[PDB]
Amino acid sequence: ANDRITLPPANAQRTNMTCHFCIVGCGYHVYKWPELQEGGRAPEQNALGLDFRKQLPPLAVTLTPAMTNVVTEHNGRRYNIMVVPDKACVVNSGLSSTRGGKMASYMYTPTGDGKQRLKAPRLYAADQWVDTTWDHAMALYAGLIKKTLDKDGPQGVFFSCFDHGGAGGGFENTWGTGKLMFSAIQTPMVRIHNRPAYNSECHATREMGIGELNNAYEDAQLADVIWSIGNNPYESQTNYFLNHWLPNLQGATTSKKKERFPNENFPQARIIFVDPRETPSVAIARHVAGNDRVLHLAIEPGTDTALFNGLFTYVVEQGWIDKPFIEAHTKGFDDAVKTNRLSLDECSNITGVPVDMLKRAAEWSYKPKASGQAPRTMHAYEKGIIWGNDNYVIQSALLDLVIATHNVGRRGTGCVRMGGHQEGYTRPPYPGDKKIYIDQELIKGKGRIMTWWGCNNFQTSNNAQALREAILQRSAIVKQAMQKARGATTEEMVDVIYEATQNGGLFVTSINLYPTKLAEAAHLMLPAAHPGEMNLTSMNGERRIRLSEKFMDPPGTAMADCLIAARIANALRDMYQKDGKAEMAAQFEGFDWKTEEDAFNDGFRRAGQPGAPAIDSQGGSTGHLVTYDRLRKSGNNGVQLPVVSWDESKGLVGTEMLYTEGKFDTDDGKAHFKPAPWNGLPATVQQQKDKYRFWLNNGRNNEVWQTAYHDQYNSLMQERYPMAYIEMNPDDCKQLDVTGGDIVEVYNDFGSTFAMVYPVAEIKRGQTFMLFGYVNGIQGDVTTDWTDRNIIPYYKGTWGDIRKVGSMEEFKRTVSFKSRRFA
Amino acid sequence: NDRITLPPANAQRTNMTCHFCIVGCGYHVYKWPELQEGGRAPEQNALGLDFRKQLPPLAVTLTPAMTNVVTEHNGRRYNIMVVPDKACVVNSGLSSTRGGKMASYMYTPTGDGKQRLKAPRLYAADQWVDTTWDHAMALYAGLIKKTLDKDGPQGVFFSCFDHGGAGGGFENTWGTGKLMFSAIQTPMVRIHNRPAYNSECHATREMGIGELNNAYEDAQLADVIWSIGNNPYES
Amino acid sequence: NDRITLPPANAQRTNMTCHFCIVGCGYHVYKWPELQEGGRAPEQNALGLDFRKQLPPLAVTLTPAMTNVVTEHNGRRYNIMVVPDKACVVNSGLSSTRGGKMASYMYTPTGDGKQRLK
Amino acid sequence: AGRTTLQYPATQVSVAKNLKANEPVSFTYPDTSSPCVAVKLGSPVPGGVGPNNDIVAYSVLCTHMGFPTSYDKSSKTFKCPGHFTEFDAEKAGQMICGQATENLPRVLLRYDEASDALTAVGVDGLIYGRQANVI
Amino acid sequence: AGRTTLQYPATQVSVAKNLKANEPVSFTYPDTSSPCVAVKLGSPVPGGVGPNNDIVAYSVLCTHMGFPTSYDKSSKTFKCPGHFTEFDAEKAGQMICGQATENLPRVLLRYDEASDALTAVGVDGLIYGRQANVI
Amino acid sequence: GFDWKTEEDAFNDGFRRAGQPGAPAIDSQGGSTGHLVTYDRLRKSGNNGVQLPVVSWDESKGLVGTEMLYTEGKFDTDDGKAHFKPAPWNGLPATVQQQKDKYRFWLNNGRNNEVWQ
Numbered sequence A: 001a002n003d004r005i006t007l008p009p010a011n012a013q014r015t016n017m018t019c020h021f022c023i024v025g026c027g028y029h030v031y032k033w034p035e036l037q038e039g040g041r042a043p044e045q046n047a048l049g050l051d052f053r054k055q056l057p058p059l060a061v062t063l064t065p066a067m068t069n070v071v072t073e074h075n076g077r078r079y080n081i082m083v084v085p086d087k088a089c090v091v092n093s094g095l096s097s098t099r100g101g102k103m104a105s106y107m108y109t110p111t112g113d114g115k116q117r118l119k120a121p122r123l124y125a126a127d128q129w130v131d132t133t134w135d136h137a138m139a140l141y142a143g144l145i146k147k148t149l150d151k152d153g154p155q156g157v158f159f160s161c162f163d164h165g166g167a168g169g170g171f172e173n174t175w176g177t178g179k180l181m182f183s184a185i186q187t188p189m190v191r192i193h194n195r196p197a198y199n200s201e202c203h204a205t206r207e208m209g210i211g212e213l214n215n216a217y218e219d220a221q222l223a224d225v226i227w228s229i230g231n232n233p234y235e236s237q238t239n240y241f242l243n244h245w246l247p248n249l250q251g252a253t254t255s256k257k258k259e260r261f262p263n264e265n266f267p268q269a270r271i272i273f274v275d276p277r278e279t280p281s282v283a284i285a286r287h288v289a290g291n292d293r294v295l296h297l298a299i300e301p302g303t304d305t306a307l308f309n310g311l312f313t314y315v316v317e318q319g320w321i322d323k324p325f326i327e328a329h330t331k332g333f334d335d336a337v338k339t340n341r342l343s344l345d346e347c348s349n350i351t352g353v354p355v356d357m358l359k360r361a362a363e364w365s366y367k368p369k370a371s372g373q374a375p376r377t378m379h380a381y382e383k384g385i386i387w388g389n390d391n392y393v394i395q396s397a398l399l400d401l402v403i404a405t406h407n408v409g410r411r412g413t414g415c416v417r418m419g420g421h422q423e424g425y426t427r428p429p430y431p432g433d434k435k436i437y438i439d440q441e442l443i444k445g446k447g448r449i450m451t452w453w454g455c456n457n458f459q460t461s462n463n464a465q466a467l468r469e470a471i472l473q474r475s476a477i478v479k480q481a482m483q484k485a486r487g488a489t490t491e492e493m494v495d496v497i498y499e500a501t502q503n504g505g506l507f508v509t510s511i512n513l514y515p516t517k518l519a520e521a522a523h524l525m526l527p528a529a530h531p532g533e534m535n536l537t538s539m540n541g542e543r544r545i546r547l548s549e550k551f552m553d554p555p556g557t558a559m560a561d562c563l564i565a566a567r568i569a570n571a572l573r574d575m576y577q578k579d580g581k582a583e584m585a586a587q588f589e590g591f592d593w594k595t596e597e598d599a600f601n602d603g604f605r606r607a608g609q610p611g612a613p614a615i616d617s618q619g620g621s622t623g624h625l626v627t628y629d630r631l632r633k634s635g636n637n638g639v640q641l642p643v644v645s646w647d648e649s650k651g652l653v654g655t656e657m658l659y660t661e662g663k664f665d666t667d668d669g670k671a672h673f674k675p676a677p678w679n680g681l682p683a684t685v686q687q688q689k690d691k692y693r694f695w696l697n698n699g700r701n702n703e704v705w706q707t708a709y710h711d712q713y714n715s716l717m718q719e720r721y722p723m724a725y726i727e728m729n730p731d732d733c734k735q736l737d738v739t740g741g742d743i744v745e746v747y748n749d750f751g752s753t754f755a756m757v758y759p760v761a762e763i764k765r766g767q768t769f770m771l772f773g774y775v776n777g778i779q780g781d782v783t784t785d786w787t788d789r790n791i792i793p794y795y796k797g798t799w800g801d802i803r804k805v806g807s808m809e810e811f812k813r814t815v816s817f818k819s820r821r822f823a
Numbered sequence B: 001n002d003r004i005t006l007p008p009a010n011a012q013r014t015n016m017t018c019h020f021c022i023v024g025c026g027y028h029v030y031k032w033p034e035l036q037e038g039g040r041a042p043e044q045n046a047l048g049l050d051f052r053k054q055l056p057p058l059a060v061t062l063t064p065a066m067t068n069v070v071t072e073h074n075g076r077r078y079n080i081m082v083v084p085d086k087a088c089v090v091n092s093g094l095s096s097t098r099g100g101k102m103a104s105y106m107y108t109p110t111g112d113g114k115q116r117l118k119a120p121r122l123y124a125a126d127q128w129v130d131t132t133w134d135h136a137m138a139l140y141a142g143l144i145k146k147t148l149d150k151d152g153p154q155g156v157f158f159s160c161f162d163h164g165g166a167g168g169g170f171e172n173t174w175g176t177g178k179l180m181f182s183a184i185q186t187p188m189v190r191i192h193n194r195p196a197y198n199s200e201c202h203a204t205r206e207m208g209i210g211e212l213n214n215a216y217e218d219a220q221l222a223d224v225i226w227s228i229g230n231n232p233y234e235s
Numbered sequence C: 001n002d003r004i005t006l007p008p009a010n011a012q013r014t015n016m017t018c019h020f021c022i023v024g025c026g027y028h029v030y031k032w033p034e035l036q037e038g039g040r041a042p043e044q045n046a047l048g049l050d051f052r053k054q055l056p057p058l059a060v061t062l063t064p065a066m067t068n069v070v071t072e073h074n075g076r077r078y079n080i081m082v083v084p085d086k087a088c089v090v091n092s093g094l095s096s097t098r099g100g101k102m103a104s105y106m107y108t109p110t111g112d113g114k115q116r117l118k
Numbered sequence D, E: 001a002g003r004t005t006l007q008y009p010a011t012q013v014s015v016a017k018n019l020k021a022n023e024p025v026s027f028t029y030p031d032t033s034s035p036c037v038a039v040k041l042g043s044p045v046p047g048g049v050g051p052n053n054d055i056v057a058y059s060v061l062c063t064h065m066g067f068p069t070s071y072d073k074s075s076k077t078f079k080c081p082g083h084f085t086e087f088d089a090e091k092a093g094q095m096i097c098g099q100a101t102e103n104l105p106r107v108l109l110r111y112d113e114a115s116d117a118l119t120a121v122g123v124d125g126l127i128y129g130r131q132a133n134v135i
Numbered sequence F: 001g002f003d004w005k006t007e008e009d010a011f012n013d014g015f016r017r018a019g020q021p022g023a024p025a026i027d028s029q030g031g032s033t034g035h036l037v038t039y040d041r042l043r044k045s046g047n048n049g050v051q052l053p054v055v056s057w058d059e060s061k062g063l064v065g066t067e068m069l070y071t072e073g074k075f076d077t078d079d080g081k082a083h084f085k086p087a088p089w090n091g092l093p094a095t096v097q098q099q100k101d102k103y104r105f106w107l108n109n110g111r112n113n114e115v116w117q
């Protein structure tokens, strides 16, 4: 049915759903109704309240076939679903991105895009994939972990697990997994989904006293200037950019600035991008605001620290700083002035940005307005610097600038992460005292068992080729050992596998929605459930916690990850009880959980309460005031964390902006400046740059979500992006005799991978941009092993050569190579 | 008393011609919530004037008579400031004593405008009372209708403004004139300042010279000015 | 609006019986120059009340309606405050809505008494 | 100084959509000794805020002699147990009957559509037992 | 009628030979509230009609939130001013970049060699802001 | 013809219709170019407005009007010429003269600077 849609009946069930994907956390409604009912076209005869008796005007709805589906429940009954944006949600005001817009299509149905969802335990029984029971899966998995604990201790048990929010994260799930890994198993051999150790993206800003989500989305409406540093927000944080940033650039929020601040000038809002690449976000900002209100600081790759040290030096020398703020609320300023000193000429030589542009950015951002107040300058950053040239140092440099200019704690300011996933962290403390580079450990032959949980590092590790090589080989040893068994009990098989891991083998488990490329190495795969198949809580980039309501059943025996963790814990407890080991059994207590809500009560709602163990929670110690029922009453607007108060008549009252009284998260309540040395690129990256021609920039496409775990099954997505693409300069293209839809090898000392050629006029000569994380042509093969002091990778820092494989005529027939930069 | 609330930098600013005399001096009306105020620094108030120190002569025209607090239909209170426009060609920032009082003569419940008519008033034989607009129209239209039906238009009399400014102007003279002349069609109409429907300027118009035939700039270019039957410093 | 000028400690105080009904409640009239005021500390104002912190119920009857600025025959301007006497046996510090407005209904050129026959 | 205005704090009350029709919310403004109520009336009134222009807020201290008044949900009034003054929540604190000489003071709320927030930003009228609203 | 198809009208657009390369023709289909464009691209494309297999036609309403898109002759694309979605006229309405979850709907044209007529006879995809293409 | 919701409607109906096609007879100080004036155009003009009659309008120029009347010698009469008139001196009117004959003082009258009307 291409040319019509079944309307939701007026009385259709409606539940709340936060978007599964990106940080912004847009609010949606899920309409659910029996397959053989429909709404009428009259606005009072359908659930949308829209008049389908005549054409709707623009902006009246977001509604396509991709936003509809028919689900088949565990009882065999069929129900229409419609997943559409909430017009009254403050986050998105009825906007839907292309990614969230596909939620309905990516819900589980037996015939649709979710048809290959994991529905039962899968086992690679030496030489073939077969189903197995949950009890056999637990006996084998628990069995191995138990054997490893008994013989090697926790250091033999490895995880890479999500720490994020939204789908495949959230407060229930991070608690469940963390409780299992850290309180029960007590393994330190744990990495995170996007980085190869147990660390933070935001060590420097946190240690300086500024948590990275310190403002409201409303702040982007109130700003004079917005910086977007290492950040492509139209593509990566769409509806924050569309619903909040653009209205400011258009002048729609001016009256609200003036109402808040009667005696302050508000010029036209301007936007500054720090990005080596001219992105869609740069183009669209120019289209909306005019070229005169956009500054693209097209820095040389890796030179962000030089940029910020030059701007900091200049604003200090001009006196464009808040000296009363510095004096009352900060420590270390005078030291930072000395350590970070860099002239605009030196800054220009390093960055490649002309001195006029450096001065202009400072004049827009820091020079007092005519009324006497500093500009309200919101500094927004993401992975261009988080995966940049020395994560810790860039944040040090940037924060120094922000603190000196009092661009934290004022409305219309903030130095924030734009975010990736939603947030939803509640976990015990990490049980080690050392940073551990998990990938390197695995590649060196450590560990008996490795579990990928809600992540796929074959596609997303730095130095991903070294990783896959090692894991495939180690998996093979286990497969070969399993093959000699005939008629073995589970316990005998556990011994067979364990022995294989003493000869270089590794048992691999994946806990997932889908097989993924991890199926090339995995011995065991367990089915998980996503939001709508379960209740799930999470918060967005302004700390707004929402409940995503269950409205349908998972596929087969798929389970919420927190309940998978409880399953594992209880299997281990039972084995220890059976083995007469009361002390070891006791470590696996506390997982008597029947629904996801129990994990919410056990984690988020216990943080900082009397008799609670140490819990690190984004909800803080007032987490207990949030209940599922209270979130339901709040709607898609939720509450900004931390919660300050609750009663029946008021609801949840929370916190708009952090640090508005100048009390920071440090020992003394002051924000702390840090030294930020410029040391160039890391030697390992510089070596690549010296040997090879092209900078291999990498990151997001608007349409593609992450490792394309859903998108790989979507015929539209596959027709548009059948292969990972690499944006190349047209002149570079002519020199390599390539054009749109040719395939190239991209390669260096670290790896070899493949991409389709995407000529892009806005790409600079000797620079490229490749889609990351993809199912066909994995970008990460060419990223280096280099990390900063806290084991944060410089994913955006690598160089390689490009060789033509040949012309893919089919790509040329079916794929658009036209410009993605709107003008 | 002895102080003034300054308009905030971002205060609302509208244009207002003086209510009163022919000169039509230009003013600005600053409007802002009662609980906000401007700062003394010139860039922190709407006037752009430096109230951190004494102002020189000619820098401003500003007294308490040029300020008020109005109460709107929503019950919310707003400071107003009614002051001459410096860049208006007519007056170049001058305010007469009459126009200078405009803020004071805006309607407020407790001020000089306190006895403004706020509803229809009816003298019901032996006492003043309020009445509704519908009752007022039923009585007034009713009478006019009865008079038209029995006496024709010649039973219905008016004396009405024909002038501009407050209590006149193009919208108002059209409205009244269309009513009196096109609809009711009564000739029994006089003007505010004279007891027939006539002109002050019959002779000069019939001689071919309408009476407002120059610019104020012409008073700047003249060798000689005659002021005939005219007290122009006062009028 | 949102504030009141306190009577100075040394403010003149006269006796006034309510203008209106039979009960004849007792009031005090505080009179002082317009450009002077009392302090919030209880010993620095004529009421003897502590305006450095919220007052409890029954501590006072005082609103802007109970205050005025009169212009005397000499042209000089004086704050007045017309408030019930706490020690009068008739009313024990009570003011009705009618007596409570006496300050407002004193003659001033711009106030409620503006149309007084002169 | 210069300044002719009191320095009112900006105090978050709640988001508008949390308020139920005719179910009063308690808060303090402009300090913890000044009890206030905000109520969604359920029907627009002059100067009401929020999506249905119907949220109003008051000081609950009687402007006669300062007893905390109580919101009656059935009449939408504030009633004083001292000398039986009653104020209309739907007429900006107009005194229905009583001994006060001042309307119940209104707490001025900003309503922000973007956040759904209600912030107390000022007071119209003088709170009982105070020389100025801001101590 | 247990009919499974919509009742599309047959609407004459023009004769093919009146179309100039890359010069869009505007028309309404399947009713006057549905703006459409037909363009001769100048070079054959999959499913193009006419003598050079190069004439294509589309609904111009953005499948995101319904703003009329504009045909850009330099790129042969349709660009939406609302949230910057852009469709390829040479790849059957493929979204190049944007927030839509559906390609630009194609107006299906019959081309009659006998008459040189181009007739709109159907739509492939769902037109913005409609329960069905035929209201 | 009084379907008016705001004062602007009266402006559109009167001033802006003078001398337009299908208009009834209207005597306006704006003349027949009054339609070029709109509230939004006057707003853009500021307190300077425009001297009537308006001669031209466009978005780039604004309202352009008329400084002085009769600068080319064309007057508002049948022939375009200014017309002299006889002006006899007849003394005061007998009604006024009778007052002057009976009573002492000439009772001149008019304006005070401070008092409006």
Ligand SMILES: Nc1nc2c(c(=O)[nH]1)N[C@H]1C(S)=C(S)[C@@H](COP(=O)(O)OP(=O)(O)OC[C@H]3O[C@@H](n4cnc5c(=O)[nH]c(N)nc54)[C@H](O)[C@@H]3O)O[C@H]1N2
Pocket: A167, A168, A169, A193, A194, A383, A387, A420, A453, A454, A455, A456, A457, A459, A460, A461, A462, A511, A512, A513, A514, A516, A528, A529, A530, A531, A561, A698, A699, A705, A706, A707, A708, A709, A710, A772, A773, A779, A780, A783, A795, A796
């Ligand atoms: N070169 C390069 N590499 C990068 C980056 C870069 O910029 N450059 N970016 C890094 C970044 S910022 C990111 S976040 C990472 C991401 O790397 P990963 O975390 O490996 O990638 P995702 O696609 O987020 O993985 C989510 C996985 O969990 C599954 N899943 C989805 N929902 C659920 C659920 O409810 N439960 C379970 N158990 N599984 C679920 C999906 O099918 C999928 O396999 O990649 C990093 N890698």
Ligand SMILES: Nc1nc2c(c(=O)[nH]1)N[C@H]1C(S)=C(S)[C@@H](COP(=O)(O)OP(=O)(O)OC[C@H]3O[C@@H](n4cnc5c(=O)[nH]c(N)nc54)[C@H](O)[C@@H]3O)O[C@H]1N2
Pocket: A022, A023, A099, A229, A230, A231, A232, A233, A235, A236, A237, A274, A275, A276, A277, A279, A300, A301, A302, A303, A304, A382, A383, A384, A385, A388, A389, A418, A419, A420, A421, A697, A698, A699, A700, A701, A702, A703, A704, A705, A706, A707, A796
């Ligand atoms: N459409 C879509 N949106 C997503 C995702 C997705 O997969 N698809 N993933 C989500 C996740 S988990 C994340 S982490 C975010 C990421 O959101 P962003 O980090 O905004 O996206 P990226 O494309 O990784 O990189 C941002 C920019 O970094 C620039 N960059 C590269 N090297 C440097 C450098 O040395 N310095 C500077 N200053 N900039 C540099 C690149 O040119 C690029 O435009 O997006 C989230 N949103």
Ligand SMILES: Nc1nc2c(c(=O)[nH]1)N[C@H]1C(S)=C(S)[C@@H](COP(=O)(O)OP(=O)(O)OC[C@H]3O[C@@H](n4cnc5c(=O)[nH]c(N)nc54)[C@H](O)[C@@H]3O)O[C@H]1N2
Pocket: B021, B022, B098, B228, B229, B230, B231, B232, B234, B235, F108, F109, F110, F111, F112, F113, F114, F115, F116, F117
């Ligand atoms: N302050 C103020 N200004 C006003 C007004 C107002 O009320 N107050 N009203 C406005 C209006 S509506 C008008 S019409 C104008 C009035 O403006 P004017 O006409 O300027 O004012 P008047 O005071 O009526 O009279 C002008 C002069 O006529 C003189 N006069 C008396 N009899 C004769 C005579 O026989 N011949 C001659 N040649 N002169 C004689 C008087 O002495 C007097 O000074 O003022 C306007 N401006």
Ligand code: F3S
Pocket: A019, A020, A021, A022, A023, A024, A025, A026, A092, A095, A096, A097, A098, A099, A100, A101, A237, A238, A239, A240
């Ligand atoms: S629809 Fe989804 S992908 Fe982000 S922009 Fe909104 S949370």
Ligand code: F3S
Pocket: B018, B019, B020, B021, B022, B023, B024, B025, B091, B094, B095, B096, B098, B099, B100
């Ligand atoms: S201020 Fe008014 S009274 Fe005449 S002189 Fe100017 S128009």
Ligand code: F3S
Pocket: C018, C019, C020, C021, C022, C023, C024, C025, C091, C094, C095, C096, C098, C099, C100
């Ligand atoms: S009116 Fe009567 S009750 Fe008292 S205050 Fe006045 S004597």
Ligand code: FES
Pocket: D062, D063, D064, D065, D066, D067, D080, D081, D082, D083, D084, D085, D098, D099, D100
């Ligand atoms: S204290 Fe309230 S009516 Fe007297």
Ligand code: FES
Pocket: E062, E063, E064, E065, E066, E067, E080, E081, E082, E083, E084, E085, E098, E099, E100
């Ligand atoms: S309405 Fe067309 S891109 Fe959103």
Ligand SMILES: [Mo+4]
Pocket: A194, A420, A421
């Ligand atoms: Mo990420």
Ligand code: NA
Pocket: A125, A126, A127, A128
């Ligand atoms: Na086998």
